[PDB]
Amino acid sequence: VLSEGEWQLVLHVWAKVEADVAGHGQDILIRLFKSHPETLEKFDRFKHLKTEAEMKASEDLKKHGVTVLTALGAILKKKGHHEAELKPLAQSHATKHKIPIKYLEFISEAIIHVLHSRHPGDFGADAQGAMNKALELFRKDIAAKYKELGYQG
Ligand code: HEM
């Protein structure tokens, strides 16, 4: 359970992300795909992209980054009371997209790295710890839904 102070750190940096949702979404997906190429293979939509320059040039990738970060921002702003938001997301990611929980750990690392690069003054160690806690809570609650549906592993 995050404290109120932890949530305030999380949402303070998140409000900075929302100044450039699409740039952050590109940076995060590109970091994910470069750091963990197995993740790119899960996207029929993107798996033709073979270089970082091609990834940066893809408008469709930039659009999907906005989709992802909009969904995540709506979850963070619930401060833990996010059951309604996680149901469809766990269902699609477990049963249609076939995304292991471990790949959610990978994208969480990419999000933290990009926030640290773009917002160092609002993403000191206290805020890094709080965002890690928030992303852990996200993964815990998604993993419980995966387990229900027979996909935790
Ligand atoms: C912060 C974590 C993530 C969030 C908030 C998120 C959110 C979303 C949303 C909102 C959609 C469209 C609606 C839906 O299908 O449910 C989507 C689609 C999808 N996501 Fe995620 N996602 C996350 C992580 C991942 C990861 C780590 C992967 C793969 C390694 C992945 C793979 C996919 C795929 C394959 C689609 C379908 C893309 C298409 O063909 O249109 N997601 N995601």
Side-chain angles (χ1 to χ4, degrees):
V1 167
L2 277 72
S3 66
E4 282 288 351
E6 287 165 342
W7 286 120
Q8 196 172 28
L9 290 173
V10 167
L11 294 177
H12 184 77
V13 72
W14 197 260
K16 308 290 188 176
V17 167
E18 289 183 336
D20 177 19
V21 179
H24 285 82
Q26 282 172 302
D27 293 348
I28 289 165
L29 292 174
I30 293 173
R31 175 60 163 240
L32 179 64
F33 295 161
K34 288 183 68 139
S35 296
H36 306 277
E38 63 274 38
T39 66
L40 177 56
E41 185 86 335
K42 292 288 177 169
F43 290 88
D44 284 348
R45 191 163 160 189
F46 299 127
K47 69 182 181 145
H48 67 283
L49 299 167
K50 300 302 194 274
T51 70
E52 180 165 7
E54 287 171 5
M55 292 174 188
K56 284 182 174 272
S58 173
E59 189 69 9
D60 198 48
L61 184 59
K62 185 171 180 175
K63 266 227 304 224
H64 198 62
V66 171
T67 298
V68 170
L69 294 189
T70 296
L72 181 60
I75 287 161
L76 295 171
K77 288 173 194 180
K78 298 305 183 113
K79 299 168 66 185
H81 294 94
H82 49 219
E83 170 63 27
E85 286 67 35
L86 270 17
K87 244 196 178 74
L89 186 71
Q91 294 175 351
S92 66
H93 286 63
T95 78
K96 179 183 219 185
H97 309 316
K98 320 292 210 77
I99 305 308
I101 300 299
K102 189 71 180 184
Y103 292 16
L104 300 184
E105 182 187 359
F106 298 154
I107 202 176
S108 295
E109 290 306 314
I111 291 162
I112 291 167
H113 190 273
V114 171
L115 278 177
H116 175 92
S117 292
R118 290 178 162 252
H119 309 298
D122 296 293
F123 209 60
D126 56 349
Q128 287 164 47
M131 184 60 76
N132 181 242
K133 281 192 159 202
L135 300 175
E136 281 207 354
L137 178 62
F138 167 78
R139 288 203 304 283
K140 174 183 165 189
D141 286 354
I142 292 281
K145 293 187 162 151
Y146 273 41
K147 184 179 184 280
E148 170 188 343
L149 296 171
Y151 295 81
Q152 192 189 274

